């Protein structure tokens, strides 16, 4: 029984072109380039989830370091100082506080300096 | 069609009990008065095929 394959290549080629929607040039139009676009856009979305944690991590560390040097201490003194007082607050929330509330952050600099110095 | 035996292999290998094959030793046809007598007695019994060259024989003669 002879098998024609027109109606299934619609589904494969269109399944690729729906994901490739939004791409410049032939990468949204031509299937033979859009498959090659979708794969490479799968690798980048796989690697950049790994890089997302580090790229926010240095954002947080930059926020804490900037506000901490406003309040009269470096970042490294502040983090050994937070470790000495046995304070389990991460860099995420601690970078979050320094933007919104300077004052609880300021007391948190004081608790860094108390056990630290 | 059914397989044809390598006929020159059927005249040199002969099936044994447990499925192996026996054969002659290949140094006893000519140039003999120089060979030591121990060397020629140890070729006179029939001997079995090694397993390195047993797949070749299972392939080449497919019936016996």
């Amino acid at each position: 029984a002879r098998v024609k394959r027109g109606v299934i290549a619609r589904a494969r080629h269109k399944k690729i072109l729906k994901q490739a929607k939004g791409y410049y040039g032939a990468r949204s139009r031509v299937y033979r380039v859009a498959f090659q676009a979708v794969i490479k856009a799968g690798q980048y979305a796989y690697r950049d989830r790994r890089q997302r944690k580090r790229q926010f991590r240095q954002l947080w560390i930059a926020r804490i370091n900037a506000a901490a040097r406003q309040n009269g201490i470096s970042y490294s003194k502040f983090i050994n100082g937070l470790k000495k007082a046995s304070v389990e607050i991460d860099r995420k929330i601690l970078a979050d506080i320094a933007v919104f509330d300077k004052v609880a952050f300021t007391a948190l600099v004081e608790k860094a300096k108390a056990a630290l110095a | 069609p059914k397989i044809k035996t390598v006929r020159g292999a059927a005249k040199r290998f002969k099936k044994t009990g447990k499925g192996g094959f026996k054969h002659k030793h290949a140094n006893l046809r000519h140039i003999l008065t120089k060979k030591a007598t121990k060397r020629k007695r140890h070729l006179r019994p029939k001997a079995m095929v090694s397993k390195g060259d047993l797949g070749l024989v299972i392939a080449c003669l497919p019936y016996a």
Partner: protein, 143 residues
């Protein structure tokens, strides 16, 4: 029941389908490697050929001849000695019970095991111990 029938588990196996994609495994060259003679269409050498070296069946010397008599003889057990017709056994009447075959002109008897009836074997050539088993069960073998 004609849409509820089904085969047992592992009866069908559905085959290596070569050259279908990446994820099949055996696709793109399908199981046969990269370049060379075994990777070609109809490639791979014949039987017994050792790549140019003098093959195994030609290094070795041919022995023996092929006896003509060894075709026309048979090797009778003791199992089918009762199957014949009652109690008397010759070359023919073994041939009608179909244990020896039509071309066959000679016959011995082997102590394979367990004859039961009183048997009269004639014209056959019973060895040593099946002699003791036909005599020991009560039969007698005349020449």
């Amino acid at each position: 029941r004609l849409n509820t029938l089904s085969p047992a588990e592992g009866s069908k196996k559905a085959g290596k389908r070569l050259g279908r994609g990446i994820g099949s495994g055996l696709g793109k060259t399908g199981g046969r490697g990269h370049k060379g003679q075994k990777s070609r269409s109809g490639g791979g050498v014949r039987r017994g050929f050792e790549g140019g070296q003098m093959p195994l069946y030609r290094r070795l010397p041919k022995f023996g001849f092929t006896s003509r008599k060894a075709a026309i003889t048979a090797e009778i057990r003791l199992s089918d000695l009762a199957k014949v017709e009652g109690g008397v056994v010759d070359l023919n009447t073994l041939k009608a019970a179909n244990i020896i075959g039509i071309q066959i002109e000679f016959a011995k008897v082997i102590l394979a095991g367990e004859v039961t009836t009183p048997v009269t074997v004639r014209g056959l050539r019973v060895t040593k111990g099946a002699r003791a088993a036909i005599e020991a069960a009560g039969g007698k073998i005349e020449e």
